[PDB]
Design an enzyme around this catalytic site. Structure first.
Site, mmCIF file in Angstrom:
data_model
loop_
_atom_site.group_PDB
_atom_site.id
_atom_site.type_symbol
_atom_site.label_atom_id
_atom_site.label_comp_id
_atom_site.label_asym_id
_atom_site.label_seq_id
_atom_site.Cartn_x
_atom_site.Cartn_y
_atom_site.Cartn_z
ATOM 1 N N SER A 160 0.803 -1.217 0.000
ATOM 2 C CA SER A 160 0.000 0.000 0.000
ATOM 3 C C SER A 160 0.839 1.272 0.000
ATOM 4 O O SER A 160 0.271 2.361 -0.137
ATOM 5 C CB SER A 160 -0.934 0.007 1.210
ATOM 6 O OG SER A 160 -1.426 -1.294 1.481
ATOM 7 N N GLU A 202 -4.081 -7.051 -6.124
ATOM 8 C CA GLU A 202 -3.251 -7.930 -6.941
ATOM 9 C C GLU A 202 -1.771 -7.634 -6.728
ATOM 10 O O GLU A 202 -0.946 -8.554 -6.697
ATOM 11 C CB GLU A 202 -3.627 -7.787 -8.415
ATOM 12 C CG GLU A 202 -4.707 -8.749 -8.883
ATOM 13 C CD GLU A 202 -6.107 -8.237 -8.609
ATOM 14 O OE1 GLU A 202 -7.026 -9.065 -8.447
ATOM 15 O OE2 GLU A 202 -6.291 -7.003 -8.558
#
Ligand SMILES: O=c1c2c3c(sc2ncn1Cc1nnn[nH]1)CCCC3
Ligand SMILES: O=c1c2c3c(sc2ncn1Cc1nnn[nH]1)CCCC3
Ligand SMILES: O=c1c2c3c(sc2ncn1Cc1nnn[nH]1)CCCC3
Length: 266
Positions: free
Chosen positions: A45, A143
């Site tokens: 992230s 993903e």
């Protein structure tokens, strides 16, 4: 060159059971602390931080771009979308999408923002434009969290992350309002209270962006810290593990951040 304390860093990753990448830099003395600084670690992230700086760079080419409304359905609601899903029945502006992605790691807001920048190749194109030749983003959100060992996809080095964050937060890669808006978004992040922030004194300003892939013990954090009476410090802490079932540790990221500040001299 570096004034490295490699012995505590090596013992830290020995107990963690994986690899730890740290690169810190004192922007006033040039002193650096580097441990596995050129190895590739999955961004997870943490790419959302550079994703917002990319949109801020485009706002100089499109004035008022951050106030553009964007609508979406449930199909775009990627798991963990704690901000975008509350505005599903109305939508959000680009600035609100960027704030949610940086401060809350909003996965839907990140995919919606990536769809507007040309995809992962578009974000990678922006990083090359600022001098980053290591950063590469390949897949879309969730993903990109596979964190497969030896996979260069969706990876960077802690050194390249630190140098890029320096040019975007303290350099000329962004105009003054765009640079200040970037610092403000990182300062208001809510996901990193147990990582780099845990190793920084409370009277120091800090802006960070975290990243957790979940698998392969892959978690990370990078931040530009503002000690009182000193030039700011930019640092990146990235972790990974050889086994898929291996868990990450936020205390290990905090401990590595503490060791980087001590190795620098704060
Ligand atoms: O809604 C929140 C929130 C909110 C926060 S934090 C948070 N965490 C989880 N969740 C639940 C969640 N939904 N999808 N993934 N997690 C602040 C603004 C209001 C909503
Ligand atoms: O976690 C939540 C939540 C949750 C909600 S609302 C909310 N508000 C703040 N927060 C924490 C917060 N984030 N930013 N400021 N405060 C519903 C689902 C469970 C999590
Ligand atoms: O992203 C998530 C997630 C995700 C979950 S839970 C969760 N909680 C916090 N966060 C916020 C965060 N984690 N690391 N940095 N910020 C499952 C799907 C993948 C994303």
């Amino acid at each position: 060159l570096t004034n490295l304390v490699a012995e505590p860093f090596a013992k830290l990753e020995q107990d963690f059971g994986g690899s730890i990448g740290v690169y810190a830099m004192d922007t006033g003395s040039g002193a650096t602390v580097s441990y596995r600084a050129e190895e590739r670690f999955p961004l997870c992230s943490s790419f959302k931080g550079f994703l917002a700086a990319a949109v801020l760079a485009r706002s100089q080419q499109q004035a008022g771009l951050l106030d553009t409304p964007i609508r979406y359905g449930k199909n775009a609601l990627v798991p963990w979308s704690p901000i975008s899903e509350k505005y599903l029945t109305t939508g959000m502006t680009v600035a609100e999408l960027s704030a949610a992605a940086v401060q809350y790691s909003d996965n839907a807001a990140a995919n919606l923002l990536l769809k507007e920048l040309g995809g992962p190749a578009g974000l990678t194109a922006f990083m090359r434009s600022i001098g980053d030749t290591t950063f590469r983003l390949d897949r879309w959100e969730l993903e990109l969290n596979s964190a497969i060992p030896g996979d260069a996809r969706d990876t960077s080095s802690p050194r390249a992350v630190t140098e890029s964050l320096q040019k975007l937060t303290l350099g000329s890669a962004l105009a003054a309002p765009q640079r200040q808006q970037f610092v403000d978004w990182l300062k208001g992040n809510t996901t990193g209270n147990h990582r780099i922030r845990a190793a920084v004194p409370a009277d120091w300003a800090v802006g960070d962006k975290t990243g957790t892939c979940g698998v392969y013990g892959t978690a990370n954090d990078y931040a530009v810290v503002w000690p009182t009476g000193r030039a700011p410090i930019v640092l990146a802490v990235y972790t990974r593990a050889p086994n898929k079932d291996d868990k990450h540790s936020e205390a290990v990221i905090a401990a590595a951040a503490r060791l980087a500040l001590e190795g620098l001299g704060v």
